[PDB]
Amino acid sequence: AAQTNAPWGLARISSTSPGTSTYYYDESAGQGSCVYVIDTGIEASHPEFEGRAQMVKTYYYSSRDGNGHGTHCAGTVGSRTYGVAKKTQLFGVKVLDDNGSGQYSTIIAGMDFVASDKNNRNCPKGVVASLSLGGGYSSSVNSAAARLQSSGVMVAVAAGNNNADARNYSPASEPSVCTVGASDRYDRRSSFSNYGSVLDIFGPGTDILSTWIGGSTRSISGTSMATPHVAGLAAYLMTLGKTTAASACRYIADTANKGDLSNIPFGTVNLLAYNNYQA
Ligand SMILES: [Ca+2]
Ligand SMILES: [O]
Ligand SMILES: [O]
Ligand SMILES: [O]
Ligand SMILES: [O]
Ligand SMILES: [O]
Ligand SMILES: [Te]
């Protein structure tokens, strides 16, 4: 399948070169997979989600996304226009309030919620969780992310936007999950992207167009935007039967575009997420 005039990041993940504008992907499109977006919520009524999104949990007075961030990330996973995996099922877990903030205890509860809740969902092709959030190093946050991964969920987490080593942030620093840095449309490391040995992969993160609340769209930047590209890619590859939740991060690294990014510090992987789709 070909989507013309796609957002640059979608075009990038199906290309061996920067500078193109068509997204190419297998029409299976993540059907039969599930992606949990653990964030500020998802505006499931957005026409871009086509009835494939729903809220499954909140820790606050509403399950509504009163911020937009979670809706944007969900859109990059699985919206019809802005998404990588255009037929996946999207499940929202609101661990962040409408200001984008959340206690680590709530975030941990949300991760253990997903590990159990997947047993209440139909995801025959597999389960992914996208965590576009983080704070300072916490062994308990890392352990929760490790449990979620161990339970059979492909966990993708943001590296963080500190232009620093991700070793000092959580859940970025948990080795067993898929830690995602950000790149721009010219194949530069995004100015704000964290780096370091713990990164597994980069995805598009600067100037990413996606869904927003009030049935709208906008472009924003972050490792938060790179993460759902990788989560969606995992769901897509799992639907194709090419990899599994336990092995998808490694598979994505194996099959990445290699050595093509600039301003990657010595000791950080130079790997850009790539679907290797050939018509
Ligand atoms: Ca890892
Ligand atoms: O974030
Ligand atoms: O962020
Ligand atoms: O972000
Ligand atoms: O973010
Ligand atoms: O982030
Ligand atoms: Te972020």
Side-chain angles (χ1 to χ4, degrees):
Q3 176 188 350
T4 53
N5 304 106
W8 78 263
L10 299 190
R12 191 71 194 81
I13 70 163
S14 60
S15 187
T16 54
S17 294
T20 71
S21 63
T22 307
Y23 176 39
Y24 307 110
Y25 64 92
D26 187 276
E27 66 177 319
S28 60
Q31 188 174 7
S33 71
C34 302
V35 187
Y36 288 82
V37 181
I38 305 177
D39 209 290
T40 63
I42 308 174
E43 186 176 280
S45 65
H46 199 302
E48 278 282 317
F49 298 123
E50 312 181 294
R52 292 180 291 99
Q54 63 185 286
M55 288 304 298
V56 299
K57 182 63 175 179
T58 184
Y59 296 92
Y60 306 92
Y61 50 79
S62 178
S63 68
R64 174 174 163 273
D65 182 9
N67 183 277
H69 182 270
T71 292
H72 194 277
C73 294
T76 297
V77 178
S79 66
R80 67 192 182 182
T81 307
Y82 311 100
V84 174
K86 297 174 187 303
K87 299 291 179 174
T88 196
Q89 289 281 320
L90 295 164
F91 301 136
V93 180
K94 182 173 174 58
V95 299
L96 302 181
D97 67 24
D98 288 342
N99 298 318
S101 300
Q103 296 294 125
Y104 272 166
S105 49
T106 304
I107 292 162
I108 289 167
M111 291 193 250
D112 285 322
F113 171 84
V114 173
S116 180
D117 184 73
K118 70 180 187 287
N119 298 312
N120 288 326
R121 310 296 166 189
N122 290 116
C123 310
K125 299 299 185 188
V127 184
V128 182
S130 193
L131 284 126
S132 291
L133 57 77
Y137 180 85
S138 163
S139 61
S140 61
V141 171
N142 285 6
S143 182
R147 289 190 300 276
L148 179 58
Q149 177 69 51
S150 170
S151 85
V153 176
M154 192 287 179
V155 181
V157 311
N161 300 341
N162 315 278
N163 189 32
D165 199 306
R167 70 161 77 255
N168 286 140
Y169 301 90
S170 290
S173 62
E174 167 49 40
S176 70
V177 302
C178 207
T179 302
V180 184
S183 65
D184 77 14
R185 73 187 301 157
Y186 300 103
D187 283 352
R188 306 179 286 217
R189 178 170 65 87
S190 301
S191 59
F192 51 78
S193 185
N194 287 349
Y195 54 82
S197 64
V198 72
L199 272 65
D200 298 280
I201 193 65
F202 284 81
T206 300
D207 298 330
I208 306 305
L209 182 60
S210 192
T211 43
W212 200 254
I213 57 170
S216 191
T217 62
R218 65 178 60 184
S219 176
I220 56 166
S221 299
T223 61
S224 288
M225 286 62 261
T227 301
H229 282 90
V230 171
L233 177 60
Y236 167 88
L237 294 169
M238 294 155 71
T239 286
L240 284 170
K242 291 182 174 287
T243 191
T244 70
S247 59
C249 189
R250 287 186 296 283
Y251 179 94
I252 288 168
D254 282 354
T255 60
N257 285 127
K258 307 170 185 74
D260 296 325
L261 297 173
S262 65
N263 203 36
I264 300 292
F266 193 84
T268 296
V269 296
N270 194 328
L271 299 172
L272 179 63
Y274 174 52
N275 74 1
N276 200 23
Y277 176 66
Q278 313 304 328

